[PDB]
Amino acid sequence: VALALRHAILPKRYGSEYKLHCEWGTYGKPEHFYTDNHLSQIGAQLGFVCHLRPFKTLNDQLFSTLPGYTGARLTLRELEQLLVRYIVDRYNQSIDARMGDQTRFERWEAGLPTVPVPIPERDLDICLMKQSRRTV
Amino acid sequence: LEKNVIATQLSEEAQVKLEVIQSLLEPCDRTTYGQKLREAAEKLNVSLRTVQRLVKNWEQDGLVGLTQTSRADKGKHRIGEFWENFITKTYKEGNKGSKRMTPKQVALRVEAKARELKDSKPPNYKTVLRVLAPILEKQQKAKSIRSPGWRGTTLSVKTREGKDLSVDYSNHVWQCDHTRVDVLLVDQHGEILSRPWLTTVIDTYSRCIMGINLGFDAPSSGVVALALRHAILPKRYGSEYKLHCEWGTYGKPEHFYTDGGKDFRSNHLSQIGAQLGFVCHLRDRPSEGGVVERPFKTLNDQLFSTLPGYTGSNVQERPEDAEKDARLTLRELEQLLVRYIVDRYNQSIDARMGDQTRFERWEAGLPTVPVPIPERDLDICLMKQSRRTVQRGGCLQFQNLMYRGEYLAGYAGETVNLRFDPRDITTILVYRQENNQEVFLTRAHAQGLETEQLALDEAEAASRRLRTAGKTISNQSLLQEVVDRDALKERQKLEQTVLRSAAVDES
DNA sequence: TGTACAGTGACAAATTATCTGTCGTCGG
DNA sequence: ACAACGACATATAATTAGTCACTGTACATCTACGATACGTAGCGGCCG
DNA sequence: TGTACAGTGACTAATTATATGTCGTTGT
Ligand SMILES: [Mg+2]
């Protein structure tokens, strides 16, 4: 969960290999974060409140169409590339009935009271995985 | 540079402060936020000003601002600088050279100076240990430092010349040095001899063991010449070795890399190297040549520590039964050690790689299959006498022995290059310089000894005895001073007899 | 980039004595 | 009138120096010395 | 019952940077 949060917060900066057309332009600290002491520390470290639906479309629009779909081979990295391409150029470019004019991304942008300032990368190190002992 | 800090093991008090801060993350209104502070002053038993300080420490540091920071004096000593420098330098001077002064002894030097200065509070011994503690840990750390290793197929061997040899393929750089084995051996009667010497020749590219010599004999340019021919030539072992794979390893190095022992930095190895066309190179430190040295720890660990008569890696680890529990002769130890090298060691995984055996990597790593050299052409191993001169009557005199040759009377007064075998000096190959090249001349023979064989150390021991006996110099006279000492024992002769019995089994 | 084998932390799987439910049996 | 920051004073555990009882490990014949090489000097025999 | 010194946990006293009140001052 902390790794998913780190990604969300930081700028994305994806490689040419994903062959994306659109930019994944979000970044930023929320006011609240809802989840399934560690996450509450992270909330207190970063300054937001921890509390304790794309899946239908990922199945229909991506995963049920892929090699090896569990009712051919596919590596984890390839699946990531497929998932990112789907997210950046299709799913976030879609318009819901409740938005009408604006896409999922555009309404996101459109609704901000202000452009947040990116959190320097180091302040998110608390999210990363850790090995506790190594010898130099 | 970047400067980040992260808190860990937060909870023990701090979880109470964390729950207070979680209750205070938003300035909701000037009316309500003050009430939230005055409520948090029930969970922490402290005033509004303590909670306002906690919120400021949190906003300026993040999670470490909840944790109590360590005092500014932590790691400083209250005794004053004079005593802190006196204690540090006293220790250091007292562990200079061979001196090994203990902290207790430093404390005695502290009480001695304090008495001279009329001080009343010379630091206590417990504080001397504390003041010297940091400079002891450093010493222990500086001994313990690990080094990584060559990783993948690329390897550059450093020489004493500061040049690095790029090791590109099998037989590009062989390496050699010697060591004692850690087992006491016995003669064929079951009496103690001595711990053999083991020599190994390794190829750097494959780390396969390309040849050995095992014996009671001393490191010598002779033992190196024998290790070289065993490495170079195609190898044959009988069924009494019970081998289940073949040591199919042979051919000639382009370079040979060694420690600075007098076996290697020698005219004899220079002449072998010039005739075989390989270049002699010097190891810059023991720690550069681990490809030679490390075969030796593996053998202690995989082979020799599991054999009777084992002596340990040093005198403080010597099994007290080693001198009573010896059982193997040199012929048994070779029959075990050769098997170990052919069936186990050359068949194990090359550790840098993880997916090849040492032999598989050698065989696949040849740039081409080399042609086996004729066993006669290994006469390049013969030692050279550079500048002896032919006497009138077609004669050469050499280590007291006098030699006669089939065309040699044609060249009285001339200078000749003599090639000889230290195992058999009865015969001399004579070469001469013509057109600034060596040309072969003749097989000179020790006159009256054509039916007889003398090794150089026998002619030498006979000459020493003959000099001190006051008798005359002649071919027989030297043979007479051999045949008594032969017929009539001394450990070196007893060792030589068991070593000979192994060489007989090689024929 | 010295080096490579044996001993040692870190993690996962199969087995068993031990802790929990549920019911039946006996005593107050 | 409410909230935040500094001046000044006051109480406090962290750090260091010191003391004390229990324990680990050396004292118990032992590495200067052996085995190679080169580099230089010498002894009498042979010749002029 | 080998034998006696240096290093080590366990506890205590002196010193100090630090946490807590209390009030004065300023911004909102
Ligand atoms: Mg050596």
PDB file of N, CA and C (backbone and C1' of nucleotides) in Angstrom, chain B residues 30 34 38 49 52 71 73-79 122-124 126-127 130 218-220 262 267 392 492, chain D residues 1-8 12-20 31 34-39 46-47:
ATOM      1  N   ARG B  30      -9.660  29.398  14.055  1.00  0.00           N
ATOM      2  CA  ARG B  30      -9.029  29.983  15.249  1.00  0.00           C
ATOM      3  C   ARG B  30      -9.793  29.668  16.546  1.00  0.00           C
ATOM      4  N   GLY B  34      -7.698  25.854  18.905  1.00  0.00           N
ATOM      5  CA  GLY B  34      -7.330  26.047  20.308  1.00  0.00           C
ATOM      6  C   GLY B  34      -8.008  25.035  21.230  1.00  0.00           C
ATOM      7  N   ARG B  38      -6.176  22.225  23.750  1.00  0.00           N
ATOM      8  CA  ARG B  38      -6.585  22.133  25.160  1.00  0.00           C
ATOM      9  C   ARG B  38      -7.190  20.766  25.505  1.00  0.00           C
ATOM     10  N   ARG B  49       1.473  25.390  26.093  1.00  0.00           N
ATOM     11  CA  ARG B  49       2.772  25.744  25.504  1.00  0.00           C
ATOM     12  C   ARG B  49       3.608  24.534  25.131  1.00  0.00           C
ATOM     13  N   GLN B  52       1.872  23.365  21.845  1.00  0.00           N
ATOM     14  CA  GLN B  52       2.277  24.265  20.758  1.00  0.00           C
ATOM     15  C   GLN B  52       3.730  24.037  20.315  1.00  0.00           C
ATOM     16  N   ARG B  71      21.350  14.532  23.568  1.00  0.00           N
ATOM     17  CA  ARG B  71      22.055  15.705  24.103  1.00  0.00           C
ATOM     18  C   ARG B  71      23.293  16.070  23.283  1.00  0.00           C
ATOM     19  N   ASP B  73      26.210  16.956  24.343  1.00  0.00           N
ATOM     20  CA  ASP B  73      27.422  16.418  24.966  1.00  0.00           C
ATOM     21  C   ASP B  73      27.679  14.944  24.632  1.00  0.00           C
ATOM     22  N   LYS B  74      26.742  14.223  24.001  1.00  0.00           N
ATOM     23  CA  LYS B  74      26.887  12.777  23.777  1.00  0.00           C
ATOM     24  C   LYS B  74      28.133  12.464  22.955  1.00  0.00           C
ATOM     25  N   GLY B  75      29.031  11.682  23.526  1.00  0.00           N
ATOM     26  CA  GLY B  75      30.337  11.339  22.953  1.00  0.00           C
ATOM     27  C   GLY B  75      31.491  12.278  23.323  1.00  0.00           C
ATOM     28  N   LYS B  76      31.245  13.414  23.980  1.00  0.00           N
ATOM     29  CA  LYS B  76      32.284  14.298  24.538  1.00  0.00           C
ATOM     30  C   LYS B  76      32.653  13.886  25.968  1.00  0.00           C
ATOM     31  N   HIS B  77      33.888  14.148  26.392  1.00  0.00           N
ATOM     32  CA  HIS B  77      34.416  13.788  27.714  1.00  0.00           C
ATOM     33  C   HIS B  77      34.640  15.011  28.605  1.00  0.00           C
ATOM     34  N   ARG B  78      34.095  14.980  29.826  1.00  0.00           N
ATOM     35  CA  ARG B  78      34.160  16.075  30.808  1.00  0.00           C
ATOM     36  C   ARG B  78      35.521  16.253  31.491  1.00  0.00           C
ATOM     37  N   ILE B  79      36.459  15.323  31.312  1.00  0.00           N
ATOM     38  CA  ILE B  79      37.773  15.325  31.987  1.00  0.00           C
ATOM     39  C   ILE B  79      38.698  16.478  31.569  1.00  0.00           C
ATOM     40  N   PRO B 122      42.995  12.641  38.532  1.00  0.00           N
ATOM     41  CA  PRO B 122      43.494  12.076  37.286  1.00  0.00           C
ATOM     42  C   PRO B 122      42.358  11.168  36.807  1.00  0.00           C
ATOM     43  N   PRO B 123      41.964  11.142  35.516  1.00  0.00           N
ATOM     44  CA  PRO B 123      40.887  10.224  35.135  1.00  0.00           C
ATOM     45  C   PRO B 123      41.013   8.807  35.674  1.00  0.00           C
ATOM     46  N   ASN B 124      39.882   8.242  36.086  1.00  0.00           N
ATOM     47  CA  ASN B 124      39.797   6.877  36.589  1.00  0.00           C
ATOM     48  C   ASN B 124      40.036   5.874  35.483  1.00  0.00           C
ATOM     49  N   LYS B 126      38.311   3.371  34.615  1.00  0.00           N
ATOM     50  CA  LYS B 126      37.124   3.056  33.809  1.00  0.00           C
ATOM     51  C   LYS B 126      37.046   4.135  32.742  1.00  0.00           C
ATOM     52  N   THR B 127      37.226   5.424  33.010  1.00  0.00           N
ATOM     53  CA  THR B 127      37.171   6.456  31.956  1.00  0.00           C
ATOM     54  C   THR B 127      38.317   6.366  30.955  1.00  0.00           C
ATOM     55  N   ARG B 130      37.102   4.173  28.282  1.00  0.00           N
ATOM     56  CA  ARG B 130      36.064   4.854  27.505  1.00  0.00           C
ATOM     57  C   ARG B 130      36.689   5.814  26.509  1.00  0.00           C
ATOM     58  N   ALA B 218      62.574 -29.662  -1.653  1.00  0.00           N
ATOM     59  CA  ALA B 218      62.544 -28.252  -1.250  1.00  0.00           C
ATOM     60  C   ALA B 218      62.085 -27.419  -2.419  1.00  0.00           C
ATOM     61  N   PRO B 219      61.473 -26.260  -2.195  1.00  0.00           N
ATOM     62  CA  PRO B 219      61.187 -25.406  -3.289  1.00  0.00           C
ATOM     63  C   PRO B 219      62.505 -25.124  -3.992  1.00  0.00           C
ATOM     64  N   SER B 220      62.542 -25.190  -5.312  1.00  0.00           N
ATOM     65  CA  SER B 220      63.813 -25.027  -6.037  1.00  0.00           C
ATOM     66  C   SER B 220      63.447 -24.694  -7.463  1.00  0.00           C
ATOM     67  N   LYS B 262      62.986 -17.200  -4.944  1.00  0.00           N
ATOM     68  CA  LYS B 262      64.221 -17.394  -5.740  1.00  0.00           C
ATOM     69  C   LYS B 262      64.024 -18.567  -6.701  1.00  0.00           C
ATOM     70  N   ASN B 267      67.755 -17.588 -13.115  1.00  0.00           N
ATOM     71  CA  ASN B 267      68.222 -17.676 -14.512  1.00  0.00           C
ATOM     72  C   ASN B 267      67.611 -18.953 -15.071  1.00  0.00           C
ATOM     73  N   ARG B 392      92.363 -28.518 -24.225  1.00  0.00           N
ATOM     74  CA  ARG B 392      93.142 -29.368 -25.140  1.00  0.00           C
ATOM     75  C   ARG B 392      93.098 -30.836 -24.708  1.00  0.00           C
ATOM     76  N   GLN B 492      67.001 -36.869   5.065  1.00  0.00           N
ATOM     77  CA  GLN B 492      66.989 -36.469   3.654  1.00  0.00           C
ATOM     78  C   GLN B 492      67.157 -37.653   2.698  1.00  0.00           C
TER      79      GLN B 492
ATOM     80  P    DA D   1     -11.974  41.124  26.926  1.00  0.00           P
ATOM     81  O5'  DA D   1     -11.697  39.932  25.897  1.00  0.00           O
ATOM     82  C5'  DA D   1     -12.781  39.329  25.201  1.00  0.00           C
ATOM     83  C4'  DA D   1     -12.275  38.434  24.084  1.00  0.00           C
ATOM     84  C3'  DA D   1     -11.327  37.317  24.529  1.00  0.00           C
ATOM     85  O3'  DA D   1     -11.692  36.089  23.911  1.00  0.00           O
ATOM     86  C1'  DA D   1     -10.323  38.599  22.815  1.00  0.00           C
ATOM     87  P    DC D   2     -11.146  34.696  24.498  1.00  0.00           P
ATOM     88  O5'  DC D   2     -10.171  34.152  23.352  1.00  0.00           O
ATOM     89  C5'  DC D   2     -10.697  33.818  22.074  1.00  0.00           C
ATOM     90  C4'  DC D   2      -9.582  33.507  21.091  1.00  0.00           C
ATOM     91  C3'  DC D   2      -8.557  32.475  21.574  1.00  0.00           C
ATOM     92  O3'  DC D   2      -8.304  31.526  20.546  1.00  0.00           O
ATOM     93  C1'  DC D   2      -7.457  34.445  20.873  1.00  0.00           C
ATOM     94  P    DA D   3      -7.516  30.163  20.874  1.00  0.00           P
ATOM     95  O5'  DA D   3      -6.128  30.331  20.096  1.00  0.00           O
ATOM     96  C5'  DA D   3      -6.123  30.492  18.682  1.00  0.00           C
ATOM     97  C4'  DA D   3      -4.770  30.977  18.195  1.00  0.00           C
ATOM     98  C3'  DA D   3      -3.576  30.122  18.635  1.00  0.00           C
ATOM     99  O3'  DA D   3      -2.762  29.810  17.511  1.00  0.00           O
ATOM    100  C1'  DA D   3      -3.196  32.405  19.151  1.00  0.00           C
ATOM    101  P    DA D   4      -1.634  28.670  17.617  1.00  0.00           P
ATOM    102  O5'  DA D   4      -0.262  29.484  17.515  1.00  0.00           O
ATOM    103  C5'  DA D   4       0.009  30.270  16.362  1.00  0.00           C
ATOM    104  C4'  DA D   4       1.201  31.182  16.594  1.00  0.00           C
ATOM    105  C3'  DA D   4       2.466  30.482  17.102  1.00  0.00           C
ATOM    106  O3'  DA D   4       3.586  30.886  16.327  1.00  0.00           O
ATOM    107  C1'  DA D   4       1.930  32.322  18.489  1.00  0.00           C
ATOM    108  P    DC D   5       4.971  30.077  16.421  1.00  0.00           P
ATOM    109  O5'  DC D   5       5.948  31.082  17.191  1.00  0.00           O
ATOM    110  C5'  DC D   5       6.227  32.361  16.635  1.00  0.00           C
ATOM    111  C4'  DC D   5       7.010  33.219  17.613  1.00  0.00           C
ATOM    112  C3'  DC D   5       8.225  32.533  18.248  1.00  0.00           C
ATOM    113  O3'  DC D   5       9.362  33.385  18.168  1.00  0.00           O
ATOM    114  C1'  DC D   5       6.852  33.478  19.918  1.00  0.00           C
ATOM    115  P    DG D   6      10.832  32.812  18.478  1.00  0.00           P
ATOM    116  O5'  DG D   6      11.293  33.625  19.776  1.00  0.00           O
ATOM    117  C5'  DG D   6      11.490  35.029  19.693  1.00  0.00           C
ATOM    118  C4'  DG D   6      11.487  35.665  21.072  1.00  0.00           C
ATOM    119  C3'  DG D   6      12.612  35.209  22.007  1.00  0.00           C
ATOM    120  O3'  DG D   6      13.149  36.338  22.685  1.00  0.00           O
ATOM    121  C1'  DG D   6      10.532  34.922  23.063  1.00  0.00           C
ATOM    122  P    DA D   7      14.617  36.284  23.338  1.00  0.00           P
ATOM    123  O5'  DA D   7      14.472  37.198  24.641  1.00  0.00           O
ATOM    124  C5'  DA D   7      13.239  37.218  25.346  1.00  0.00           C
ATOM    125  C4'  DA D   7      13.425  37.732  26.761  1.00  0.00           C
ATOM    126  C3'  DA D   7      14.709  37.293  27.436  1.00  0.00           C
ATOM    127  O3'  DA D   7      15.032  38.185  28.497  1.00  0.00           O
ATOM    128  C1'  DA D   7      12.848  36.043  28.272  1.00  0.00           C
ATOM    129  P    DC D   8      16.354  37.950  29.379  1.00  0.00           P
ATOM    130  O5'  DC D   8      15.853  37.017  30.579  1.00  0.00           O
ATOM    131  C5'  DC D   8      14.808  37.464  31.434  1.00  0.00           C
ATOM    132  C4'  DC D   8      14.332  36.344  32.344  1.00  0.00           C
ATOM    133  C3'  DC D   8      15.446  35.502  32.971  1.00  0.00           C
ATOM    134  O3'  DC D   8      15.570  35.812  34.356  1.00  0.00           O
ATOM    135  C1'  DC D   8      13.574  34.176  32.233  1.00  0.00           C
ATOM    136  P    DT D  12      12.048  17.211  38.949  1.00  0.00           P
ATOM    137  O5'  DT D  12      12.772  16.834  37.575  1.00  0.00           O
ATOM    138  C5'  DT D  12      12.050  16.908  36.349  1.00  0.00           C
ATOM    139  C4'  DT D  12      12.846  16.291  35.214  1.00  0.00           C
ATOM    140  C3'  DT D  12      13.680  15.070  35.601  1.00  0.00           C
ATOM    141  O3'  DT D  12      13.627  14.098  34.566  1.00  0.00           O
ATOM    142  C1'  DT D  12      15.074  16.699  34.647  1.00  0.00           C
ATOM    143  P    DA D  13      12.554  12.904  34.632  1.00  0.00           P
ATOM    144  O5'  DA D  13      12.939  11.968  33.394  1.00  0.00           O
ATOM    145  C5'  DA D  13      14.118  11.170  33.443  1.00  0.00           C
ATOM    146  C4'  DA D  13      15.037  11.488  32.278  1.00  0.00           C
ATOM    147  C3'  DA D  13      16.119  10.449  32.011  1.00  0.00           C
ATOM    148  O3'  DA D  13      16.464  10.460  30.632  1.00  0.00           O
ATOM    149  C1'  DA D  13      17.139  12.459  32.653  1.00  0.00           C
ATOM    150  P    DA D  14      17.168   9.181  29.962  1.00  0.00           P
ATOM    151  O5'  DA D  14      18.477   9.784  29.264  1.00  0.00           O
ATOM    152  C5'  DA D  14      18.348  10.689  28.172  1.00  0.00           C
ATOM    153  C4'  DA D  14      19.705  11.227  27.739  1.00  0.00           C
ATOM    154  C3'  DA D  14      20.788  10.176  27.526  1.00  0.00           C
ATOM    155  O3'  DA D  14      21.641  10.573  26.461  1.00  0.00           O
ATOM    156  C1'  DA D  14      21.414  11.617  29.311  1.00  0.00           C
ATOM    157  P    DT D  15      22.850   9.625  25.995  1.00  0.00           P
ATOM    158  O5'  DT D  15      24.113  10.203  26.788  1.00  0.00           O
ATOM    159  C5'  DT D  15      24.480  11.568  26.633  1.00  0.00           C
ATOM    160  C4'  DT D  15      25.761  11.874  27.388  1.00  0.00           C
ATOM    161  C3'  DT D  15      26.818  10.769  27.342  1.00  0.00           C
ATOM    162  O3'  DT D  15      28.084  11.327  27.013  1.00  0.00           O
ATOM    163  C1'  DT D  15      26.382  11.394  29.587  1.00  0.00           C
ATOM    164  P    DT D  16      29.365  10.379  26.801  1.00  0.00           P
ATOM    165  O5'  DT D  16      30.210  10.590  28.140  1.00  0.00           O
ATOM    166  C5'  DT D  16      30.533  11.907  28.564  1.00  0.00           C
ATOM    167  C4'  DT D  16      31.138  11.899  29.956  1.00  0.00           C
ATOM    168  C3'  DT D  16      32.272  10.892  30.166  1.00  0.00           C
ATOM    169  O3'  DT D  16      33.325  11.508  30.890  1.00  0.00           O
ATOM    170  C1'  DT D  16      30.630  10.597  31.816  1.00  0.00           C
ATOM    171  P    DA D  17      34.808  10.891  30.854  1.00  0.00           P
ATOM    172  O5'  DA D  17      35.145  10.630  32.396  1.00  0.00           O
ATOM    173  C5'  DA D  17      35.141  11.716  33.314  1.00  0.00           C
ATOM    174  C4'  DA D  17      34.953  11.222  34.736  1.00  0.00           C
ATOM    175  C3'  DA D  17      35.929  10.127  35.176  1.00  0.00           C
ATOM    176  O3'  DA D  17      36.518  10.472  36.422  1.00  0.00           O
ATOM    177  C1'  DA D  17      33.686   9.460  35.596  1.00  0.00           C
ATOM    178  P    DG D  18      37.690   9.565  37.041  1.00  0.00           P
ATOM    179  O5'  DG D  18      36.927   8.614  38.074  1.00  0.00           O
ATOM    180  C5'  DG D  18      36.169   9.186  39.129  1.00  0.00           C
ATOM    181  C4'  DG D  18      35.404   8.119  39.889  1.00  0.00           C
ATOM    182  C3'  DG D  18      36.229   6.890  40.283  1.00  0.00           C
ATOM    183  O3'  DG D  18      36.333   6.808  41.698  1.00  0.00           O
ATOM    184  C1'  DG D  18      34.081   6.290  39.416  1.00  0.00           C
ATOM    185  P    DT D  19      37.235   5.667  42.379  1.00  0.00           P
ATOM    186  O5'  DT D  19      36.190   4.507  42.717  1.00  0.00           O
ATOM    187  C5'  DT D  19      35.054   4.794  43.521  1.00  0.00           C
ATOM    188  C4'  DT D  19      34.219   3.548  43.745  1.00  0.00           C
ATOM    189  C3'  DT D  19      35.016   2.289  44.096  1.00  0.00           C
ATOM    190  O3'  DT D  19      34.453   1.671  45.244  1.00  0.00           O
ATOM    191  C1'  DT D  19      33.541   1.855  42.293  1.00  0.00           C
ATOM    192  P    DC D  20      35.226   0.470  45.978  1.00  0.00           P
ATOM    193  O5'  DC D  20      34.444  -0.834  45.487  1.00  0.00           O
ATOM    194  C5'  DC D  20      33.030  -0.894  45.602  1.00  0.00           C
ATOM    195  C4'  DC D  20      32.495  -2.167  44.977  1.00  0.00           C
ATOM    196  C3'  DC D  20      33.385  -3.398  45.169  1.00  0.00           C
ATOM    197  O3'  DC D  20      32.598  -4.511  45.574  1.00  0.00           O
ATOM    198  C1'  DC D  20      32.868  -3.122  42.891  1.00  0.00           C
ATOM    199  P    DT D  31      57.734 -19.151  20.479  1.00  0.00           P
ATOM    200  O5'  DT D  31      58.507 -19.284  19.087  1.00  0.00           O
ATOM    201  C5'  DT D  31      59.559 -18.384  18.776  1.00  0.00           C
ATOM    202  C4'  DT D  31      60.472 -18.966  17.713  1.00  0.00           C
ATOM    203  C3'  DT D  31      61.331 -17.946  16.991  1.00  0.00           C
ATOM    204  O3'  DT D  31      62.547 -17.746  17.703  1.00  0.00           O
ATOM    205  C1'  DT D  31      60.315 -19.459  15.428  1.00  0.00           C
ATOM    206  P    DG D  34      68.998 -23.504  10.744  1.00  0.00           P
ATOM    207  O5'  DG D  34      68.321 -24.151   9.449  1.00  0.00           O
ATOM    208  C5'  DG D  34      67.245 -25.071   9.598  1.00  0.00           C
ATOM    209  C4'  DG D  34      66.514 -25.268   8.282  1.00  0.00           C
ATOM    210  C3'  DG D  34      67.415 -25.549   7.079  1.00  0.00           C
ATOM    211  O3'  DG D  34      66.868 -26.598   6.295  1.00  0.00           O
ATOM    212  C1'  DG D  34      66.041 -23.670   6.637  1.00  0.00           C
ATOM    213  P    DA D  35      67.751 -27.291   5.145  1.00  0.00           P
ATOM    214  O5'  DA D  35      67.193 -26.643   3.794  1.00  0.00           O
ATOM    215  C5'  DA D  35      65.820 -26.792   3.453  1.00  0.00           C
ATOM    216  C4'  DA D  35      65.461 -25.921   2.263  1.00  0.00           C
ATOM    217  C3'  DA D  35      66.430 -26.010   1.080  1.00  0.00           C
ATOM    218  O3'  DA D  35      65.703 -26.099  -0.141  1.00  0.00           O
ATOM    219  C1'  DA D  35      66.153 -23.765   1.722  1.00  0.00           C
ATOM    220  P    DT D  36      66.422 -26.623  -1.480  1.00  0.00           P
ATOM    221  O5'  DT D  36      67.548 -25.522  -1.768  1.00  0.00           O
ATOM    222  C5'  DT D  36      67.962 -25.253  -3.099  1.00  0.00           C
ATOM    223  C4'  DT D  36      67.237 -24.039  -3.650  1.00  0.00           C
ATOM    224  C3'  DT D  36      68.106 -23.084  -4.447  1.00  0.00           C
ATOM    225  O3'  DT D  36      68.161 -23.496  -5.806  1.00  0.00           O
ATOM    226  C1'  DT D  36      66.824 -21.866  -2.861  1.00  0.00           C
ATOM    227  P    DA D  37      69.434 -23.233  -6.736  1.00  0.00           P
ATOM    228  O5'  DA D  37      69.373 -21.670  -7.064  1.00  0.00           O
ATOM    229  C5'  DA D  37      68.342 -21.127  -7.853  1.00  0.00           C
ATOM    230  C4'  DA D  37      68.315 -19.624  -7.644  1.00  0.00           C
ATOM    231  C3'  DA D  37      69.617 -18.926  -8.022  1.00  0.00           C
ATOM    232  O3'  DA D  37      69.737 -18.703  -9.398  1.00  0.00           O
ATOM    233  C1'  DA D  37      68.896 -18.197  -5.940  1.00  0.00           C
ATOM    234  P    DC D  38      71.173 -18.510 -10.101  1.00  0.00           P
ATOM    235  O5'  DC D  38      71.549 -16.992  -9.766  1.00  0.00           O
ATOM    236  C5'  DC D  38      70.644 -15.945 -10.097  1.00  0.00           C
ATOM    237  C4'  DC D  38      70.982 -14.678  -9.333  1.00  0.00           C
ATOM    238  C3'  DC D  38      72.247 -13.962  -9.803  1.00  0.00           C
ATOM    239  O3'  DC D  38      72.044 -12.555  -9.796  1.00  0.00           O
ATOM    240  C1'  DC D  38      72.452 -14.521  -7.514  1.00  0.00           C
ATOM    241  P    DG D  39      72.898 -11.616 -10.781  1.00  0.00           P
ATOM    242  O5'  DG D  39      74.171 -11.197  -9.908  1.00  0.00           O
ATOM    243  C5'  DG D  39      74.018 -10.291  -8.823  1.00  0.00           C
ATOM    244  C4'  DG D  39      75.288 -10.216  -7.996  1.00  0.00           C
ATOM    245  C3'  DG D  39      76.588 -10.136  -8.807  1.00  0.00           C
ATOM    246  O3'  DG D  39      77.258  -8.911  -8.533  1.00  0.00           O
ATOM    247  C1'  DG D  39      76.759 -11.697  -7.009  1.00  0.00           C
ATOM    248  P    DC D  46      98.605 -28.944 -14.223  1.00  0.00           P
ATOM    249  O5'  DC D  46      98.682 -27.845 -15.380  1.00  0.00           O
ATOM    250  C5'  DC D  46      97.498 -27.458 -16.068  1.00  0.00           C
ATOM    251  C4'  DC D  46      97.760 -26.264 -16.967  1.00  0.00           C
ATOM    252  C3'  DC D  46      99.015 -26.375 -17.840  1.00  0.00           C
ATOM    253  O3'  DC D  46      98.693 -26.082 -19.193  1.00  0.00           O
ATOM    254  C1'  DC D  46      99.005 -24.321 -16.658  1.00  0.00           C
ATOM    255  P    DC D  47      99.760 -26.360 -20.362  1.00  0.00           P
ATOM    256  O5'  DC D  47     100.201 -24.895 -20.828  1.00  0.00           O
ATOM    257  C5'  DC D  47      99.218 -23.975 -21.285  1.00  0.00           C
ATOM    258  C4'  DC D  47      99.757 -22.556 -21.281  1.00  0.00           C
ATOM    259  C3'  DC D  47     101.032 -22.341 -22.106  1.00  0.00           C
ATOM    260  O3'  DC D  47     100.826 -21.305 -23.057  1.00  0.00           O
ATOM    261  C1'  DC D  47     101.240 -21.376 -19.948  1.00  0.00           C
TER     262       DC D  47
END
